[PDB]
């Protein structure tokens, strides 16, 4: 099914007043489009989740450690995912933990 | 112009320092992003780097300098004051400029600390799964008389889920949780059966590059308090074993509630160093 | 006034009152940065209208067609806007009684011209 | 095989019909998407079209046929039953197949109804702002003795915001809100000081093209109940003025709560046609 999504990285735990660090758009229809820098890879990785965005966190880097300072960062996904409306978020204890857990996943490579 | 962070009197480190025990001749290795050795409130006397291209006496992140200052910030008329200001401070760079480090890098740092006669290892870092080489490295350090301390993790609580990370989860390591100035558990502090003791980890003011100071939150800030407390005990009673120092820190801790959330409680170095 | 800063938005039209199970009728993406981009068919006009609301998307409903009437049957249709609006996170929705009322109230507004 | 929609006994239209008053000789104009005149349960005796290439006696949408059946569906052994089944029904096509209409089109329909001796105008439609031509058309119809009824709107409530649309908001028009089978206000029913009376507007079963039946929601469904109720009163007491019929409908309505949400309440045509 077609997708029309906005992905963001925000400073904090997912509060509405949280500062936006970065955002991108992605469209997966006739072709992979959007302001996302790698639309084809992001659509392929998006469709691979089979509508379950928590699967983007299923392949963390098993060889990395992070400093244990707490400065939360939250990833968000909103729009249409394979024809279905979605509003998803996930918080990490810091940007190091985010980076290690997402492990270069094309969806958040922006 | 010297400021005493709330954590020093909270763990009663000021009482032990008042007795004349400040960590002198005790070797503490801070396994982190390095330490800004040129900081006027820190004295780095050695170390090693296991991060390619980076020197051990530089800290391009800031985390390592902050953690080091909680341990060893000098007793003078500037900046802050560490728990154990007279310690022999060693910078063991295992995390790069961006905070990232590999398990093999941490292993190299722990082995360096064991071979170079460190008394205390501080690891304000964590991973979700650990490694067999990491378990082996911390078991050997502790068996060879090193007090091994680590941040419990910042994964919070979810029902009865155990959220303690590695290396803190290993039995040879002291898993340290975070409390605030009111001795209340910080919401981010990891929980579980391996949680051993608590120490100040919210609003922790310490040294920061370049030649400055910052306030940070985390079990990263809690762990150096217990590392410094281990150094105070050993500067007062040098012939105690690593397990004796470890047992004194948990046995004399101030009970704050359920061990799942607080371990044995908030460390009391005055009672632990009696 | 008018708002400043970058925007990264997804606009949808859904069958219903804004329930999560509501059927999507149409959706588009819009990026407002140095240039107006996205899968939106008129990005520059859509960004211009957005910035003119000054962070208040209810201003998209401020210019209804003053010469149209609609039948008063209730079959709800909802417009949604999610993402970053001029540097600020947004989750906005508006329900119209039917598609006639939506069309008349939005009155060819560039944001929902997709 | 005749079905009585819940709305006919709720407004007590069945009691007035039991007295032998069914709207006979009363002219009701349904200003809408037209009426499927060939429907076996409807009898369209005239009208006019103010839409492009459509005849008045056809309905390519369905809305107009549904509204007409609530006023006038025939008392027989098929389909449904209208509030006033013996009325002289007139189709005044002012909305196109998609349901859209212009203010000038509505004005043309209201003027047609006034010139052609209609007793009751039903307008199951609304616009947000109205016009001087529209105000003039409804004021003239009411001044010339036409009972003018309209859907209050389906804009719901938001705090104390007045959400009544035009033509319902004009003082010469009866603004009709929607209640369900439990006499509870439908969430979509518009609110405000001009809300006059309520009538069934949720799950209203009525005639629908082609030769069938449908269940719809809206103040569009409520409005023809009041139009039909006006026709029943006038079939029993034909010499009452439009304001006297209007005042009987609001004076005898069943109190359901605050006038902001319910107007005078749910119409009771048995009490209104006393
Ligand atoms: O019942 C016959 C009607 O034509 C008389 O009603 C006239 C109406 O008051 C003016 O439109
Ligand atoms: C949202 As702005 C920076 O124009 O106030
Ligand atoms: Ca100092
Ligand atoms: Ca442990
Ligand atoms: Ca019938
Ligand atoms: Ca009125
Ligand atoms: Cl319809
Ligand atoms: K709204
Ligand atoms: K509206
Ligand atoms: Zn601005
Ligand atoms: Zn009487």
| Strand tally of chain A | 6
Give me the CATH fold name of chain A.
Subtilisin Inhibitor
Which pair of chains has the greatest number of interface residues, and how are they split between the two chains?
C-D, 19 and 37 residues
CATH topology of chain B: Rossmann fold
CATH architecture of chain A: 2-Layer Sandwich
Measured between the Cα atoms of the first and last residue of chain B, the distance is 31 Å
Strand segment tally of chain B = 11
- Which CATH top level class of chain B fits? Alpha Beta
What summary fits the major beta sheet of chain A? 5 strands, antiparallel
State the domain count of chain B.
Answer: 1
Described by strand count, sense and barrel closure, the largest sheet of chain B is: 7 strands, parallel
> Helicity range of the residues of chain B?
25-40%
Radius of gyration of chain B, taken over Cα atoms and rounded to an integer in Å: 16 Å
Shape of chain A: globular
Provide the structure class of chain B.
alpha/beta
**Global outline of chain B:** globular
**Continuous helix count of chain A:** 2
Family (chains B, D): Belongs to the peptidase S8 family.
Binding site for Ca(2+) 2 (chains B, D): 168, 170, 173
Binding site for Zn(2+) (chains B, D): 237, 274
GO molecular function (chains B, D): metal ion binding; serine-type endopeptidase activity
Question: Can I get a quick summary?
Answer:
The complex is a heterotetramer, with two copies of chain A and two copies of chain B (274 residues). With 110 residues, chain A is α+β, with helices and mostly antiparallel strands. Chain A has a single domain (1-110), classed as Subtilisin Inhibitor (2-Layer Sandwich).
